Amino acid sequence: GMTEYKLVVVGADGVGKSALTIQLIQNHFVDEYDPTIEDSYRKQVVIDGETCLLDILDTAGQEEYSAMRDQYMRTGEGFLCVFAINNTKSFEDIHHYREQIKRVKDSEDVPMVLVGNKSDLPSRTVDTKQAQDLARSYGIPFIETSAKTRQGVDDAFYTLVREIRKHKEK
Ligand SMILES: C[C@H](Oc1ccnc(-c2noc([C@@]3(C)CCCc4sc(N)c(C#N)c43)n2)n1)[C@@H]1CCC[N@H+]1C
Ligand SMILES: Nc1nc2c(ncn2[C@@H]2O[C@H](COP(=O)(O)OP(=O)(O)O)[C@@H](O)[C@H]2O)c(=O)[nH]1
Ligand SMILES: [Mg+2]
C-alpha cells in the first residue's frame, strides 16, 4: 500500500509555514494566507521512486499546552522547524519548538529538519553557519528555503520523509 507520512510544520508567526506548505501543495507562491488558519493538506508525491502520500499540518494560532493540543501535535511523525533568515527572534525560538516536540513525542530522536526560510531576501540576520551549527548540535539536517522562489521546498519536505523512514527502519 501507499505509505502516508504525517508532517508538521512549526515555528514563529510569520516565518513562512503556510507559504512553504502551499508551494508544496499548489506549486504556487501565496504571499498572503490568513495567519490564524491551522489546517492539514495532502499531496501524493514521488520520493526516491516511491509514490507516497504526504499529510502536512501547517500550524498556526495561539500557544497552548492542553492535552488536546498535545494530542494533535503527537500525530506528527516528523517536524519542520522553520525560522526566517532575516528574523533573529524566530531563530532564537527554535529551541523551544524542538523541546516541545521532544516532550510530546516522548523521544530524544524525533525526525526533524531545521528550515531557514526567506533565503531570497538580502536582509539576512542569521548566518548560515550559525544555523548549520544548530542543526549539527541537534544532529539533524538543515535546509535553506524560499517559499517565494521554491528554493529548497522539496528538499525540506522530502528530507523529512527520509528522516522518518530512517527512524522507522531502526
Ligand atoms: C517560542 C514561544 O512562542 C510560541 C508561540 C507559539 N507557539 C509556540 C509553540 N511551541 O511549541 C509549539 C508546538 C505547536 C510545536 C510542536 C509541539 C507542540 S505540543 C503543543 N502543545 C504545542 C503548542 N502550542 C506545540 N508551538 N511557541 C515563546 C517562548 C515561550 C513563550 N513564547 C512567547
Ligand atoms: N520574501 C519572502 N517572503 C516570504 C517567504 N515566505 C513567506 N513570506 C512572507 O512572510 C509573511 C508570512 O508568511 P506566512 O506564510 O503567513 O507565515 P506563517 O505565519 O509562518 O504561516 C508573508 O508576508 C509572506 O508573504 C519567502 O520565502 N520569501
Ligand atoms: Mg500560516
Residue numbers in the entry: 0 to 169
The article reads:
KRAS mutations are among the most frequent gain-of-function alterations found in patients with cancer and their therapeutic targeting has long been a key objective in precision oncology. The KRAS GTPase cycles between an active (GTP-bound) and an inactive (GDP-bound) state. Here we report the discovery and characterization of a non-covalent inhibitor that binds preferentially and with high affinity to the inactive state of KRAS while sparing NRAS and HRAS. The pan-KRAS inhibitor works by preferentially targeting the inactive state of KRAS to prevent its reactivation by nucleotide exchange.
Extensive optimization led to BI-2865, a derivative with a prolinol substituent and a pyrimidine linker, which enabled a direct ionic interaction with E62, as well as a water-mediated hydrogen bond network with the side chain of R68 and the main chain carbonyl of Q61. We established high-resolution cocrystal structures (1.0–1.1 Å) of the pan-KRASi (BI-2865) in complex with several KRAS variants. These showed a conserved binding pocket across variants defined by the α2 and α3 helices, the distal portion of the β1 sheet and the distal portion of the Switch II motif in KRAS. A part of the KRASi pocket overlapped with that occupied by covalent G12C inhibitors, such as sotorasib and adagrasib, with the notable difference that the pan-KRASi engaged the pocket without relying on a covalent tether and did not extend in the P-loop channel near the G12 residue. By comparison, the affinity was 60–140 times lower for KRAS variants loaded with the GTP analogue GCP. Selectivity for the inactive state is probably conferred by the conformation of the Switch II motif (including residues Q61 and E62), which partly occupies the drug pocket in the active state conformation of KRAS. As a result, BI-2865 inhibited the proliferation of isogenic G12C, G12D or G12V mutant KRAS expressing BaF3 cells more potently than precursor 1 with a mean IC50 of roughly 140 nM. Last, the inhibitor attenuated tumour growth in mice bearing KRAS G12C, G12D, G12V and A146V mutant models, without causing apparent toxicity to the mice (at least as determined by monitoring animal weight).
